[PDB]
Design an enzyme around this catalytic site. Structure first.
Site, PDB file in Angstrom:
ATOM      1  N   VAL A   5      29.641  22.512  -7.380  1.00 15.65           N
ATOM      2  CA  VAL A   5      28.652  21.796  -6.589  1.00 15.65           C
ATOM      3  C   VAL A   5      29.336  20.562  -6.002  1.00 15.65           C
ATOM      4  O   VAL A   5      29.200  20.282  -4.811  1.00 15.65           O
ATOM      5  CB  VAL A   5      27.410  21.445  -7.434  1.00 15.65           C
ATOM      6  CG1 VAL A   5      26.374  20.646  -6.657  1.00 15.65           C
ATOM      7  CG2 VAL A   5      26.780  22.695  -8.032  1.00 15.65           C
ATOM      8  N   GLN A   6      30.137  19.899  -6.847  1.00 15.10           N
ATOM      9  CA  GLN A   6      30.880  18.686  -6.537  1.00 15.10           C
ATOM     10  C   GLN A   6      31.721  18.867  -5.270  1.00 15.10           C
ATOM     11  O   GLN A   6      31.695  18.024  -4.365  1.00 15.10           O
ATOM     12  CB  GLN A   6      31.763  18.313  -7.730  1.00 15.10           C
ATOM     13  CG  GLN A   6      31.002  17.675  -8.887  1.00 15.10           C
ATOM     14  CD  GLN A   6      30.498  18.651  -9.926  1.00 15.10           C
ATOM     15  OE1 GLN A   6      30.136  19.788  -9.629  1.00 15.10           O
ATOM     16  NE2 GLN A   6      30.451  18.201 -11.170  1.00 15.10           N
ATOM     17  N   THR A  26      -3.816  -5.406   0.608  1.00 14.10           N
ATOM     18  CA  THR A  26      -3.236  -4.079   0.721  1.00 14.10           C
ATOM     19  C   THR A  26      -4.079  -3.262   1.696  1.00 14.10           C
ATOM     20  O   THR A  26      -3.544  -2.531   2.529  1.00 14.10           O
ATOM     21  CB  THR A  26      -3.050  -3.410  -0.650  1.00 14.10           C
ATOM     22  OG1 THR A  26      -4.312  -3.101  -1.249  1.00 14.10           O
ATOM     23  CG2 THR A  26      -2.204  -4.226  -1.603  1.00 14.10           C
ATOM     24  N   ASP A  27      -5.404  -3.425   1.595  1.00 13.35           N
ATOM     25  CA  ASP A  27      -6.351  -2.802   2.502  1.00 13.35           C
ATOM     26  C   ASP A  27      -5.946  -3.043   3.960  1.00 13.35           C
ATOM     27  O   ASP A  27      -5.966  -2.112   4.761  1.00 13.35           O
ATOM     28  CB  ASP A  27      -7.785  -3.246   2.203  1.00 13.35           C
ATOM     29  CG  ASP A  27      -8.824  -2.430   2.955  1.00 13.35           C
ATOM     30  OD1 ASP A  27      -9.095  -1.286   2.521  1.00 13.35           O
ATOM     31  OD2 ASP A  27      -9.324  -2.924   3.992  1.00 13.35           O
ATOM     32  N   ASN A  54      21.610  21.617 -10.133  1.00 12.67           N
ATOM     33  CA  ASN A  54      22.135  22.960 -10.315  1.00 12.67           C
ATOM     34  C   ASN A  54      21.084  23.810 -11.025  1.00 12.67           C
ATOM     35  O   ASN A  54      20.914  23.712 -12.239  1.00 12.67           O
ATOM     36  CB  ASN A  54      23.479  22.959 -11.050  1.00 12.67           C
ATOM     37  CG  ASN A  54      24.189  24.297 -10.983  1.00 12.67           C
ATOM     38  OD1 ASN A  54      23.755  25.203 -10.273  1.00 12.67           O
ATOM     39  ND2 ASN A  54      25.280  24.428 -11.717  1.00 12.67           N
ATOM     40  N   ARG A  81      29.098  33.640  -9.527  1.00 13.69           N
ATOM     41  CA  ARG A  81      27.800  33.256 -10.060  1.00 13.69           C
ATOM     42  C   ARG A  81      26.813  33.043  -8.909  1.00 13.69           C
ATOM     43  O   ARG A  81      27.199  33.094  -7.737  1.00 13.69           O
ATOM     44  CB  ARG A  81      27.943  32.015 -10.951  1.00 13.69           C
ATOM     45  CG  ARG A  81      28.337  30.754 -10.194  1.00 13.69           C
ATOM     46  CD  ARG A  81      28.472  29.482 -11.017  1.00 13.69           C
ATOM     47  NE  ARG A  81      28.600  28.325 -10.135  1.00 13.69           N
ATOM     48  CZ  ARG A  81      28.579  27.055 -10.533  1.00 13.69           C
ATOM     49  NH1 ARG A  81      28.441  26.759 -11.816  1.00 13.69           N
ATOM     50  NH2 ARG A  81      28.700  26.082  -9.644  1.00 13.69           N
ATOM     51  N   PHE A  93      32.918  28.756 -10.921  1.00 13.55           N
ATOM     52  CA  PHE A  93      33.113  27.576 -11.750  1.00 13.55           C
ATOM     53  C   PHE A  93      34.015  27.902 -12.937  1.00 13.55           C
ATOM     54  O   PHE A  93      33.560  28.454 -13.942  1.00 13.55           O
ATOM     55  CB  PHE A  93      31.786  26.981 -12.222  1.00 13.55           C
ATOM     56  CG  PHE A  93      31.915  25.620 -12.860  1.00 13.55           C
ATOM     57  CD1 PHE A  93      32.330  24.523 -12.117  1.00 13.55           C
ATOM     58  CD2 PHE A  93      31.586  25.422 -14.197  1.00 13.55           C
ATOM     59  CE1 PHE A  93      32.429  23.267 -12.697  1.00 13.55           C
ATOM     60  CE2 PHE A  93      31.685  24.163 -14.775  1.00 13.55           C
ATOM     61  CZ  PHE A  93      32.114  23.088 -14.027  1.00 13.55           C
ATOM     62  N   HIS A 128      20.194  26.751 -12.570  1.00 14.78           N
ATOM     63  CA  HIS A 128      20.949  27.837 -13.169  1.00 14.78           C
ATOM     64  C   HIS A 128      20.116  29.114 -13.185  1.00 14.78           C
ATOM     65  O   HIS A 128      18.904  29.062 -13.335  1.00 14.78           O
ATOM     66  CB  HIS A 128      21.403  27.460 -14.590  1.00 14.78           C
ATOM     67  CG  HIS A 128      21.806  26.034 -14.755  1.00 14.78           C
ATOM     68  ND1 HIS A 128      23.028  25.557 -14.320  1.00 14.78           N
ATOM     69  CD2 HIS A 128      21.180  24.990 -15.345  1.00 14.78           C
ATOM     70  CE1 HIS A 128      23.136  24.277 -14.630  1.00 14.78           C
ATOM     71  NE2 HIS A 128      22.016  23.905 -15.264  1.00 14.78           N
ATOM     72  N   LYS A 188       0.828  -1.192   0.000  1.00 15.10           N
ATOM     73  CA  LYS A 188       0.000   0.000   0.000  1.00 15.10           C
ATOM     74  C   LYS A 188       0.870   1.253   0.000  1.00 15.10           C
ATOM     75  O   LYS A 188       1.723   1.418   0.867  1.00 15.10           O
ATOM     76  CB  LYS A 188      -0.971  -0.029   1.184  1.00 15.10           C
ATOM     77  CG  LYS A 188      -2.078   1.009   1.096  1.00 15.10           C
ATOM     78  CD  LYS A 188      -3.123   0.687   0.054  1.00 15.10           C
ATOM     79  CE  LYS A 188      -4.468   0.353   0.662  1.00 15.10           C
ATOM     80  NZ  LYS A 188      -5.279  -0.445  -0.283  1.00 15.10           N
TER      81      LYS A 188
HETATM   82  O1  LIG Z   1      -5.996  -7.150  -7.060  1.00 13.49           O
HETATM   83  C1  LIG Z   1      -5.776  -6.929  -5.878  1.00 13.49           C
HETATM   84  N1  LIG Z   1      -4.591  -7.319  -5.290  1.00 13.49           N
HETATM   85  C2  LIG Z   1      -4.265  -7.115  -3.945  1.00 13.49           C
HETATM   86  O2  LIG Z   1      -3.182  -7.522  -3.522  1.00 13.49           O
HETATM   87  C3  LIG Z   1      -5.271  -6.443  -3.193  1.00 13.49           C
HETATM   88  N2  LIG Z   1      -5.305  -6.057  -1.870  1.00 13.49           N
HETATM   89  N3  LIG Z   1      -6.448  -5.455  -1.652  1.00 13.49           N
HETATM   90  N4  LIG Z   1      -7.164  -5.430  -2.793  1.00 13.49           N
HETATM   91  C4  LIG Z   1      -6.471  -6.040  -3.785  1.00 13.49           C
HETATM   92  N5  LIG Z   1      -6.717  -6.283  -5.107  1.00 13.49           N
HETATM   93  O1  LIG Z   2      29.159  23.529 -10.064  1.00 10.83           O
HETATM   94  C1  LIG Z   2      29.083  23.145 -11.222  1.00 10.83           C
HETATM   95  N1  LIG Z   2      29.394  21.846 -11.562  1.00 10.83           N
HETATM   96  C2  LIG Z   2      29.345  21.329 -12.862  1.00 10.83           C
HETATM   97  O2  LIG Z   2      29.662  20.154 -13.052  1.00 10.83           O
HETATM   98  C3  LIG Z   2      28.926  22.266 -13.849  1.00 10.83           C
HETATM   99  N2  LIG Z   2      28.743  22.126 -15.209  1.00 10.83           N
HETATM  100  N3  LIG Z   2      28.334  23.276 -15.684  1.00 10.83           N
HETATM  101  N4  LIG Z   2      28.240  24.167 -14.677  1.00 10.83           N
HETATM  102  C4  LIG Z   2      28.604  23.583 -13.510  1.00 10.83           C
HETATM  103  N5  LIG Z   2      28.685  24.013 -12.216  1.00 10.83           N
HETATM  104 AR   LIG Z   3      26.208  22.773  -3.058  1.00 13.53          AR
END
Ligand SMILES: O=c1[nH]c(=O)c2nn[nH]c2[nH]1
Ligand SMILES: O=c1[nH]c(=O)c2nn[nH]c2[nH]1
Ligand SMILES: [Ar]
Ligand SMILES: O=c1[nH]c(=O)c2nn[nH]c2[nH]1
Ligand SMILES: O=c1[nH]c(=O)c2nn[nH]c2[nH]1
Ligand SMILES: [Ar]
Ligand SMILES: [Ar]
Ligand SMILES: [Ar]
Ligand SMILES: [Ar]
Ligand SMILES: [Ar]
Ligand SMILES: [Ar]
Ligand SMILES: [Ar]
Ligand code: NA
Ligand code: NA
Ligand code: NA
Ligand code: NA
Lengths: 295, 295, 295, 295
Positions: free
Chosen positions: D227-228, D57-58, D254, D176, D159, D256, D10
């Site tokens: 950034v690296q 799932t219910d 990034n 920048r 950069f 820009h 779920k």
């Molecule tokens: O098709 C379904 N699969 C499930 O596992 C399920 N669980 N609740 N309802 C469901 N319906």
């Molecule tokens: O910080 C940056 N890292 C990058 O790899 C990069 N490439 N273009 N601009 C950039 N600026």
């Molecule tokens: Ar950063």
């Protein structure tokens, strides 16, 4: 400290390309969002302020644009491969390129019956995507997918016979709604390089088409025992229809729709067999994943 | 102080309804998001903590669900009218009901050629909507619309001859891309009540269909002088095709795509006539509105 | 057909500006999203493909950037006025300028106790906004607002004594949760032009500060009879604290949180006085609006 | 075919809990979005329509709600552990539980100087999260993080000295803007079970506080080489301040901001040293990741 893993590059590069058949006058457009992340001997840029090892993200944005001008951008699997091979062949210290492509739909418009030569419509938010990892001396791994494919059937979906304990309140049902957004991934056999990728090119559309065709049909025709049972059927049909696919992956939300008891008001009957009006539930949602390979 | 204006109610009521032809076995689903806001003599709830005048938002949520069970939810214009009439006829102190409906697409799936009886696909995020204002002793005003209809043509769009002063940097173009999301509203003549609304019901789909058909065709076939010129053509075609429509409204973003000069790199040519690769611009965007009525 | 209404221009212009006190070395940054729409004698651009009347949206984007360089961008009310006056004074055929500004938060960071001279944090998605309409020969109307201010009190909120009929299922409560996102607008007296706007400048921050201060205090201290009763108290406090404000407007969602009956499982008690765990409901939501002016 | 991997459960369970000190009358609220996915011997539910193996799932949604009533929901690391241990201890065929928690901010309001006993404000969209994987016979792995922490410094970011080839157009800069949304993850040593988790509980807040404190300070005080270089400094400070942390991970866009040449218009000077007005770029964006562990 020390650098255990590192990758860097450019995300969310929006890209458009038109093809003009100057014979017919038919134009085809393509639109994608592209991300390229690189790895290699780049640790010093992190530990020693050594920028000499960095292909600037800006330049990677250039390269995407350039590669697209110099090559076809379809199919995605191929474009990815070409783009990723570039980085690892061009730079000594770059040893892997990671290329995610998201493809956007521009479906030719039908006007007064006729396919129109240069007008298009976004007829869904469904995407075709690729993850293409090009590692030096290892080849090209490709994960293809379709995603955001949103479906709903109004009947022929069941869910009964699940474990019941002192946590269980859910009623067994032999007729419910089933709605999901389909996320399907199929993973190709390792390719050795660009040549092998080029030798299979026609298969990439074919397999995509197959994946979507199977997805939609199995969903509509299957009397669903569960999401679990229905997605496995799709997966095994896809694996059987293309031997270059090694595994198939589905992630699927269960987008519940609840019955509304309306019987407190004028004894109105709107449950079970009488159910006509339903509350779509934004949350929470069941989530079901599976990876299926060959026995 | 004093209350100058006041409205209150329930927003974002998600609603599903299925129709089962138990003859054919064909099911049709409908899905919408509903908002109902009321007005009337409710000032005391604000000024004097007098809750006695308040139909609880919760109950308005009940009423939406109830009304949907008791009536067809299609066409939107009709459902709105029925829902809004209810509030003003039921409660003495409630003098206006404001009903916005957003309709969601569930298009029947085609499987192996054949229309499938109970499986559906969200084949766009395009919506059909209504704003229906039911004022006591005044009738029913209806604004219908389609929205989120996203289109792009790759050529046959121009923009030249605009004012040029010392603020202008934009180059005149005789060939560009044009992309937009269509927001089109058409406003019906005042109706006297539910009876009159019911007498025109077939017109509501018809006019919607027309609006979409004209929108798509004019966009694809027009050699656009500007967004301004192209949207006015759509509007005047719709007005001419349905006399119960008093005005037509378009709001349209100009979703620019810029040329990429790639000539700094290997004298590569990608502008003007050579342009193949384009940068879609998330922002900013041109925005163009027009209201068109009869001369 | 004929043009009944028309406006056009540029939406979503992102704008940053830094102020450097080269004495102290303290920098202040400002960030906003700007929209400017113009009106005037521009109908021919729609009806006759006459672009000669159009100040290009592109150029309006230039003008925003230019005006920001040439003038302070704070307070929003003033920037709007300057920007809108420009358009109507510059162009004969342009008779109104519509300027929406959304302001983004960059709050100076406190580092090791000390306010840092050039580092900032987005410490909320709450916005300060303006709508400034500059109409030729009519002056300058200003709607200021704060929005996206999300609050929740865990007690001291009541809702009882609302109308109960055969649509009502909601239980009276003398202790509930109240959560909302605050949208508050206050509308200034008409100003005659830029001069009058400039003469009141200090009031714009003051009134904003007041609006937010009253909003937060009244919410926290009031034993809420309803959203209706609590928002009216805020409104009348703001009106009383600034005479240049003509009306005050609140739009407020009621973001419900439901009790969870957990008594089916080990007779666990989690309702009424025992309630500890709650289900926040994404939808639907109560929506309550009010406009309050002077008696 | 065969099931290679499978998990299900779920997602997006919204959860609120209040604590009332009935002595002081001070209330503390907590709000989170919870996902629980299970693994085990559940393949037959996929291959053989065998629902007998499925905890619905219910019911998992029930269990989340129940566990929250029966236990403290703070700190996240502990709640996760308790919730995940439940599933694997309760069900024989369930062998792993995967618990993601997203925590939402409700910061006590200061009114007229004084901390208010039961009123709260969402003073950021920044989240504190956990990923807690409870595998049977393997213990409890915990990835803690803060995310959505959006910062900007107006100067003291450089950069220069990056690789320049025939793909490079970016100018070296010694001053920048640097803006990012911080995503920081720190991974704890494997714990043996609930007991060990409980023995360290005070460390979880402490380390979170540290992570945020270091993040903000290093960002503001560092004369960024890239950034690296700046993110690596943060990482190594965190690792040095808590020995139960095995690795530290940063993902950083990034975001820009470009200079606007305004010199075409009235020789206006707005670049280099004169730069006051900037175009924030929605896309594309640089993306920089690093994993840092101990040498
Ligand atoms: O098709 C379904 N699969 C499930 O596992 C399920 N669980 N609740 N309802 C469901 N319906
Ligand atoms: O910080 C940056 N890292 C990058 O790899 C990069 N490439 N273009 N601009 C950039 N600026
Ligand atoms: Ar950063
Ligand atoms: O079609 C257009 N209309 C306009 O008003 C405009 N302004 N810049 N580009 C434009 N294109
Ligand atoms: O404060 C409230 N006002 C309302 O109008 C309402 N309706 N349901 N609950 C409510 N709470
Ligand atoms: Ar492309
Ligand atoms: Ar399914
Ligand atoms: Ar519906
Ligand atoms: Ar258009
Ligand atoms: Ar600004
Ligand atoms: Ar309120
Ligand atoms: Ar919670
Ligand atoms: Na290499
Ligand atoms: Na009435
Ligand atoms: Na003018
Ligand atoms: Na187990």
């Amino acid at each position: 400290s020390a650098v255990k893993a590192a990758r860097y590059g450019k995300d969310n590069v929006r890209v458009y390309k038109v093809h003009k058949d100057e014979k017919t006058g038919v134009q085809t457009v393509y639109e994608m969002t592209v991300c390229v992340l690189l790895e290699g001997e780049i640790e010093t840029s992190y530990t020693k302020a050594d920028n000499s090892v960095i292909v600037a993200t800006d330049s990677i944005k250039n390269t995407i644009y350039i590669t697209a001008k110099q090559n076809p951008v379809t199919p995605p699997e191929l474009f990815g491969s070409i783009l990723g091979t570039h980085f690892i062949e061009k730079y000594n210290h770059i040893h892997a390129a990671h290329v995610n492509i998201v493809c956007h739909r521009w479906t030719r418009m039908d006007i007064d019956g006729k396919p129109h030569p240069h007008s298009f419509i976004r007829d869904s938010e469904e995407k075709r995507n690729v993850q293409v990892d090009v590692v030096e001396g290892k080849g090209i791994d490709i994960k293809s997918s379709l995603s955001g494919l949103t479906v709903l059937k109004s009947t022929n979906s069941q869910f009964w016979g699940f474990l019941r304990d002192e946590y269980t309140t859910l009623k067994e049902t032999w007729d419910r709604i089933l709605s999901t957004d389909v996320d399907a991934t199929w993973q190709w056999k390792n390719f050795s390089g660009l040549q092998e990728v080029r030798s299979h090119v026609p298969k990439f559309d074919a397999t995509w088409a197959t994946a979507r065709e199977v997805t939609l049909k199995t969903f509509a025709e299957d009397n669903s025992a569960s999401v679990q049972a229905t997605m496995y059927k799709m997966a095994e049909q896809i694996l059987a229809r293309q031997q270059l696919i090694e595994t198939v992956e589905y992630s699927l939300p269960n987008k519940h729709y609840f019955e509304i008891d309306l019987s407190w008001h004028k004894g109105l009957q709107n449950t079970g067999k009488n159910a006509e009006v339903f509350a779509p539930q934004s949350d929470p949602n069941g989530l079901i994943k599976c990876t299926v390979g060959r026995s």
